[model samples]
Target: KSNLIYDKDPGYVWDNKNECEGAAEETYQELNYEPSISADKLTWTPTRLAKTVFNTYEDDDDFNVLCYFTDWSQYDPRIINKEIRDTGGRSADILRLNTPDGRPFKRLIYSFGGLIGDKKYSADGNASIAVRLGVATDPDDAIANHKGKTIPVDPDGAVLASINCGFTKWEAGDANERYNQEKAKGLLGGFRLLHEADKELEFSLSIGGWSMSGLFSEIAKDEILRTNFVEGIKDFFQRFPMFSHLDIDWEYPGSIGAGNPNSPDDGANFAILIQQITDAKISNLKGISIASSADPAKIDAANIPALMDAGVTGINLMTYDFFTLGDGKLSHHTNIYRDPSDVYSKYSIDDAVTHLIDEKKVDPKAIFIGYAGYTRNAKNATITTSIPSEEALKGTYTDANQTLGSFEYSVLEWTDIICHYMDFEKGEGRNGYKLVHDKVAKADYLYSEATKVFISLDTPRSVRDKGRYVKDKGLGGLFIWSGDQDNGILTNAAHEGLKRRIKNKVIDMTPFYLD
Candidate 1:
């Protein structure tokens, strides 16, 4: 039989035909039958179609696509706020690069919400107010507590204040506009595309970043606080129907990750928050969390086992930033594997996944490997057959609106890296740089003796290899740190690497130029 359920009965009905009183609205054929543990010996394979503009993911657990776009990147001066705006919101972008079924990009996770902001837990400073979720004591006296100090009103109603993401109200609003595309020309742009196609896509809000996670511990540790947070988040989701997921990004658990605060209980508390949300069963909502791939403290990670829940889409193991940050030598930050001679033994995607799966006992299906669409550059670097032994670069190479960390260095988009540094195609000598993929690491790097610069990043080729690794290891799928950097190159490559076909191939350069 060609169907999973049809093996039970060859005459099993699957279509809306005259056999019924009223004609059925849909007909479906299932492929690839697998044994079930049911008493009937037949499993109920269900498929959900879109209700409004949302698109549904395949019930089969083959692959899940996750693309993150920073709330701030909507105004990234490099591309005209319009270009960056159009990529995710436009149906054309999804037709080319979204899911295998062209489901208008399954999920768009808006990044970073900083400790989720509560006045009860946080007293002063930027952490004082819960702006994103609109948490406050009351409207009259609580305005002093919030950073924005007042709920904003819109044509529809009182426009909820854009919460604590360290940006202006207009900026956040414009970003959301670009995200959902309010006008939609006929107010039926992506809306029409998704509905007509019957796709069920979702948008989400990601909370916490490297510098703004100060209150994560405080809130998660207390039951009352967690409940308040749950209620607040519930209200937030109700207010913003366009969003459907809550992505928790507490850089790391026990110690400062990416220059953020952490506590020993943070790991356990993180799982508690996940469980709380799962128990709440918020309508049309799911959870996604981040895990450290490099094993920075080599703790074997308690959070993974505690985070085993069905409410979450999956936990994304950030595979990038494997390289040492401050006072460290130049190295491949996001390598799939570490070279034998490499001193950083834990700095590999394989090591992280193994620990999470075998040692930590985390469900392999609950994990998704992350990808970096940018490159790390080290200037004034020394070249050798081997990687650098010490910090070699200055603080000159940074991106626009870049956040400076301990190393005072940052990442640049793949397009910008190529245009500025790489003068030719990869693998061939380009200007003073040559693109080389190391077999041991299964990653790519750029080396140049002329400019004395060493850069490491993901390319279409290497990202594909990682995707193959994900499939072989039985991990869920890919979690891109962003869709703003690459023109669907890294994302498409990763999806294709998993033996999945993607239609978003042609990179539109018209958006790159303003004239």
Candidate 2:
């Protein structure tokens, strides 16, 4: 198990650790959160039995939820061997979110996708995320003076080792650009180029794989590209002081069109991944989740188990939140008020944990249960959804305001007694056309008396019930639907709900213990 660290600078960590004050910096990138962690003091801890979720804010304030499969990939300094080194210096903070005072957990499970063959990317800092780059296998091999055995780590030379495997639409008579190793190597920028930027950041990667055949169309092309990415990152680490950590994001068989003779088969991707991980001698990896949509049952049994064998630590079952089940049936109008009594699976989170832990006997640690923020509705098997225009949306704390705590009862009563306000509003008032904002204001007066209220609650009792089920079943932990869907900071409904049911280390429940 590797122990990692986070950059103290909030903005710095958010900006890929390159956004420093003394550094010649420019723009910065935002980050997504991984929920399977907890924090105290300045550090975040990755509890083996605790699986959680985090969120990422895309260009669209829309959130994408994802899970942290293992601590190996954690962006903190891993306690590998001792000296607490950032082996390849990668891994994002185990816990934390974009919104400060942010709700603790994200609701959706996410896995990255997309493949682009761009080796030139390796020359740039943080080029390792690119599919491929030039190779700088060992830092001591080239550039600075070579010493025996101790793979001298240098950030500067890393850039030089990276290859510019980029592509250009070659016209009818353009030079041969179909994957020439020598030509690719010659085009690469030298290793020293990386140190020049105490803070400048840029990138390009030119390696990629083909769909269907799942075989490298060009071998030499891949070799140089791989070298470029690995070494480019090594250089970035040695050259830049403002930055620390080497994190690689892995996207798995996002395409569910496996089993199809012609298409981007998710099965092929798994086979390729198995070979890569095994050949790379990547023993550092603890466990991983195969984030795919193909139904576990439908997935070819032979192919699926191979995935588990191929270094998968656990499964982060993806329960999509894009379309609600009811909406797909055209009961869209009843969505907000539809049958909360509808029967649904106890949640696939438990199932995933069972399959991996009991069936596969994989360690339960770091096995992330999934979540999604936005709701997904499907009447039958069809999905139906249409998010309102951004114009109609206001990122306010509506849910927070709508649900009332116990205290507000006193105020509502006082107002009614004085004829200042009605206990409940009018018409839509039956259920209370209740404005969330109104509920928040009213709950204040009602509960001031119950100082003994101990704690307030809001999230569905069913979900809380689910948490209890989790604890009793000795299952890992509960993951939410989506992080963004929770109430704003001061009114984080999800955190409050979980905290409410939790009386001890495990959830306090009154279940029949029927199981």
Candidate 3:
């Protein structure tokens, strides 16, 4: 925690080694707290956690809940400008009426998906999320930056390197007149209603996603690019004061996505980028979270200690979709516990969190498990065969991107599909899809031989258990793929399990100058 050294300004790390050490030592004695990291000890007590939650604003009971209010959700004509109830099927009911403990859980809207790499975006730093990863030359230097090796430094240069850093529509009235005009008009969606009913809800913007990470490695590698990125980020925060934080959803460093490139040093460079933001204090944004992987091969393997030291709020470990697309198997996409039968299967929520703590030495309290609001299934399968052989599922996924081959299964079946099986339309079973719970693993999967379908899903029971797992392991909190999905069942269940007083106290960052 004392690693990020500073002297006069809290914005940047102290360059002089001796000066940095002196400042740290002086602050050590000044800020006092019983720093206990043992499993038996926690820095934040239940009382403080409650106070922290409620004291932050106008609220009753308090807890952290991360939800994605996507750019697509806002602009999609089907969903845009429509009230939650108008969408039908308890969607609005869940968002407007649901309560965990007489109080609504906090929601963070991570607007502005992927990066848009083009002239319209580059000229004004306003673009969509789609990335152009094909070959492009740096117009200024005219150098061959193969496979998007470098993002063009200047805006005038045609054939630029990567996507625009922020949403352009935000610049309306002040810099651009097109924000409330035409395309930008509907982007507001029901944000009016959202603010009307939900006063305490938080908002954020996710920089890069699965298909839009082409610029992360290139941008992070260069100090100039980092500075530009930071400036763009600051501008974004200034435009939308309601946005409380930024979620760096780079998917991910040292990992390839949909032809995206990766550098061995990408992870280290990311830490530098994160450090710069905290050190610069460019914005009063609460904190930042990174979308992490359960595999530990991506950004997790980077300079994790340094990144945490630099003041990352937490890591949203995507616990779902452990198995998807390319595998060609009926497997548990997301589970709290790993199935022992699959020799190659070592990934699970428990294992992912454990690795971050025990192996990578990350703070247990800074890990948030990602939950899937939908399901992945093996269609037209032999019922008894649980996994690896189950095929013909509802979802269409031929590759890791879920875009390769067979587009017929394009439509997604939400968690409600699983609900239909368990509650309404009972599959051929003693009750319906049997409640197949692996007590040891703390997971639930449904396999019905008569119906010839096998599914891995989360129910209220299993979701609650996972919540207990989060508390038991001392994790930060939960982040849902979307606030719009799941019709709100799993989310509320998760809240139920997490709202109780935590057994372990969270490590306090009060004394550290990093945050």
Best-matching candidate per lDDT? 1
State the number of backbone clashes in model 3.
Answer: 10
The per-model lDDT (C-alpha) reads 0.49, 0.25, 0.47
lDDT of 2 by residue, 444-470 (tens): 111111111111112222333334443
User: How badly does each model clash, as a count of residue pairs?
Assistant: 13, 79, 10
Candidate 3 global TM-score: 0.64
Question: How much does candidate 2 score in TM-score?
Answer: 0.35
> For residues 198-232, what per-residue lDDT tens digits would candidate 1 score against the true structure?
44666666666555556666767878667766765
Give RMSD (Å) of candidate 3 vs. truth: 19.1
Q: TM-score of each candidate?
A: 0.66, 0.35, 0.64
What's the residue-level lDDT of 242 in candidate 1? 58
Off by over 4 Å in 2: 1-113, 117-275, 278-287, 292-294, 299-302, 322-366, 377-463, 476-515
Q: What is candidate 3's lDDT per residue for 1-515, written digit by digit as tens?
A: 11111122121111222222122122223433111111111111100001111111222333365776443321111111222211212111123222323333465554444332323224422221112222222333222122222221222111111111112222323112222212122222233234445566666667776656766777788887677667656655554555577788777677775456677787788888888777667555888877777876653545566667667887878787665545555456677876544532346788778778987788887787876655555544343334422322222222323210111131123323332345412222232355455554566565544444455666556666777777777777777765545444455557656645432222222221111
Better by TM-score, candidate 3 or 2: 3
Shift of residue 242 alpha carbon in model 3, Å? 0.9
